[PDB]
Amino acid sequence: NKAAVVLCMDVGFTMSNSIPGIESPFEQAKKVITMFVQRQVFAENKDEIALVLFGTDGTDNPLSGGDQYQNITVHRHLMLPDFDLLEDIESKIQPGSQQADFLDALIVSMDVIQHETIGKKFEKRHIEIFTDLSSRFSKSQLDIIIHSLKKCDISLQFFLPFSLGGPFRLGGHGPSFPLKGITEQQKEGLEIVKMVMISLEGEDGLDEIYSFSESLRKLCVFKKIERHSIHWPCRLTIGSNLSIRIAAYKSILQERVKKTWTVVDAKTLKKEDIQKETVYCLNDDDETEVLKEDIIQGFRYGSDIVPFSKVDEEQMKYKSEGKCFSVLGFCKSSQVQRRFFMGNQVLKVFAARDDEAAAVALSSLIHALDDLDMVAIVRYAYDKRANPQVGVAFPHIKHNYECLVYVQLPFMEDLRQYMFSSLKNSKKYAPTEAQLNAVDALIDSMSLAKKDEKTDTLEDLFPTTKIPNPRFQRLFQCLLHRALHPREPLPPIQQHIWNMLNPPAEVTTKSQIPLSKIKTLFPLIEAKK
Amino acid sequence: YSGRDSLIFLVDASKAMFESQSEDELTPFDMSIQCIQSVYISKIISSDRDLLAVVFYGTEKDKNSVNFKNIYVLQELDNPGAKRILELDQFKGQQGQKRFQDMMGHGSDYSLSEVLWVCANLFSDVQFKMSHKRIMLFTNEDNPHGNDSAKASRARTKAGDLRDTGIFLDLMHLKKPGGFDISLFYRDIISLRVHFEESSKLEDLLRKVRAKETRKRALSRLKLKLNKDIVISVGIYNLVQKALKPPPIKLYRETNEPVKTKTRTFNTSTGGLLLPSDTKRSQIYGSRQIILEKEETEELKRFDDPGLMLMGFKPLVLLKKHHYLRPSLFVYPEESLVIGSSTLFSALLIKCLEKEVAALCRYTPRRNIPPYFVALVPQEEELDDQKIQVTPPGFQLVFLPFADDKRKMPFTEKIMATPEQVGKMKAIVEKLRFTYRSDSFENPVLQQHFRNLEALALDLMEPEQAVDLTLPKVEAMNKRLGSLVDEFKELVYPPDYNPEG
């Protein structure tokens, strides 16, 4: 539902100072807030936004009292953002000439959140703070802020220009800020925000804190306002005498935008004048018009098309029986292979909510499957309308819980077979040993994981599962470009998109020399495209 | 590739095939008729693109351009059709064989050389890209022309001629009370047991086969680049494709001819016909809607040229296997444009298998399409008992989700259970274990679609029953377990809580 979220940003000059060689925290914050605002606006969710800004040259605050609560200006209260807010963001957000303390701005933000929440149901409250921490401040109301958070339980997410802990990349893989560039005020603010967020949440709260550059790389900025989709309340079936009520959830799905492009007139600019229609006429008998109810389907059976209606099919077709979902057989996990995992989406199935006995039963099942390396084939039917499917589900235990994941499995009609040559016997394509060693060296210089010291875990230079789709970002960038200025051609793929899209250049530079090594050691020729 | 295929079927006209040692058993003529109808409908379902013919010999009448006596063709080499099915169907049964003997001749002498000649001639009468040879025969007599040794000589001469001209034959055993006794005249004129019986491969013909088996076709001809200039010829295939019902063929009410579709847009206020140029893409976000045209919309969708650029290497264990988005693809090395790419493919597969690391690679399937990140999963070549590959060599294609594709889940905690119950259903699963095989699970719903389709096409008396395998045989498992299910119910569930609400 509606989330009462407000964004607080300093309008000081400390972050607005032109930082040589690195984008200033003002510009980084502006980029991140523009991304968030365009995402929220083009999602058109029911969450409002208010404009709280401290450090402004003016002073307009609901709790202004001199010295304190100064340089704070509030323009728009918690209403749904529009394109006016976007044009003010790209226009009115300028380097300022006033400094203050962010505690007063947070206090007035929570005050207006509390005031304007009456008369409208809010799912939760949220606020995120963008500060460079390079300004002198008094640690007066931070504890009072924590106490108010305890009695309000407002979601908080923190983002700073400096990295929590090289190549110049925006949101990619590199140091967001050098460890020496932070001043004493920056370190003081870092310690203050660390202890505040520890008091609020803790270590997970520290994980909730990110950098200005790498915030675009992750959806954790939207993690506070996320809402899960619908689920499947049904019952597990084992034989006849055993059954468990379940609430299945779609774990991974290739999400698609709800909004599609319509058609408007070049002059009316509306769908009303446009009237698409479809015409069916007897092409054989000199385009003789055919009624939309005097029309029949058919199917090519053999070397001919057999006439066939529609309603007759559905009254003679196979009939499923509701949302049946029943296990079929028991097989070792080694028998199944990854390449046979079918189904577009990935489903996570769970029992009925808070059914403790069912939860214990399924947990014991999970443990038995894990110890036995065991999986079970299950037939799935969404409802009587759906064509029933079959597949397998396996248990997956995390550090905090255990998960059940179901995947669809194909049929013989789905299976495709082909004859492939034996590359081992291909003496015409047998590499030399030195070429093999060069390939190994290139892989080592190109490998993305090094065995971590002092920890048995394996490092990952490429956390790509937490990178969202950049295609949507480019869509939305070009969308706002057209909305603001429907005159000039569209912007191209900006470089920082590649920066959180490309690999870091360090591995590339490591592989440069072996790249030359193999491209020289391996003769090859190519034909014209 | 290999183009169209031709299958030709030969049955002698003689009273031996109209009679059986046991009258309960079918006649060879009737069993051949029902088997040929079965294989016709199976081929119609499966691979209807190819060419089939029907021809008879030894009759009292002849039908062929060569005008060789008693040589009567019935259906020439054509794609099978339901009319052919029915016009061969009415001759099945006792009355069918009676009406066949009435309107059609049966029982006469001939030569094998002349029937071979005319069948080769009609095979030559096809102007399609031939793929393979299949000229079936059906006889319970191994010595039909041993009376004239010159006839046997010319028959084996013409068989050598066909095998020289790239023609392949095959022989079907028919039941013989004295034993069919192959090698008396065959195994030398053609390309074991005397076979008193007949079932040698007909049992494979009688079983219903329903599939599509898409032929050897490359999914996409793609060029791979490592950094900026390393050019590699690669070929992408799929071992699995979602099977769908054939599209309905829209057609007229009465004449049932396929009506063509006309689609047009016209004005409302003006009433006149609109133009494609006037069409503008429009979406309404906020107060101000967005005016756009399609061409620049796919230009925005256009990001990069098709190609696979290596984004690095990651061990196979680091990726979580539950992350899938699509049926996995499979690439194979090519040497069409780039020469020597297969050597590189071999070297890299060997090195990666030694190092058990995946190969992350940015993926662009087609022009003006958004790119994507894929990891290359190597695959070995596994042979069967007869050293025939069961696991193709090459690389699998796994698909990794983005941040947004991972739907948020409601909070779930960890709950423990007694290890006694754990061992209890360990015993339960050990009771009902088996081994999965991929060749035992079809979609019976599509099978029933087809079943109704031939039922209406051939006016079959009943809608053929779909032999579903997705339904469990609940009685068997309940018998096997019995008093263990209520033991679980008492062990875990409270003895007052029904599983229902």
């Binding site: 077979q417 | 199976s42 393979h132 086969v209 599939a211 088996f434 060749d439 395998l469």
Partner: peptide, 23 residues
Amino acid sequence: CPGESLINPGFKSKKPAGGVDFD
């Protein structure tokens, strides 16, 4: 050739769908 579809050259023979056989 054994192991190949007698009804379809270039394709393997397919054994009919069986379902399950518990142990």
